[PDB]
Amino acid sequence: MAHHHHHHMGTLEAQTQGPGSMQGSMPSSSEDVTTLCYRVTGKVQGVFFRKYTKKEADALSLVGYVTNNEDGSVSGVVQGPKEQVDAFVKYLHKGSPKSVVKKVSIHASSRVDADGFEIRR
Secondary structure (H helix, E strand, O other), X not given: OOOOOOOOOOOOOOOOOOOOOOOOXXXXXXXXXXXXXXXXEEOOOOOOOHHHHHHHHHHHOOEEEEEEOOOOOEXXXXXXXXXXXXXXXXXXXXXXXXXXXXXEEEEOOOOOOOOEEOOOO
């Protein structure tokens, strides 16, 4: 009695996650206005999602500027309330979902004038 059995499976229809749009910027003189320079290193796989980065900054109302470097690392400066800068660095510890961050590096640099968050290449 010859008898063979079949096999079959399906697939998964994924989704494209959209962006958002907010913004928060105030030039203050209060002692609380904090500023630190950011520089993160990443795996050579994919660039930093300006999407989630700017959404983060816009939501928590951080000002400053971000860009990618020929060194490979993504650098910039964050300014704003101490705790929101904290929020951003905590975000930076996570990085972009598809960017395997190697090492994060921050710098004590005092208040600068904001320019814009955009992974320039």
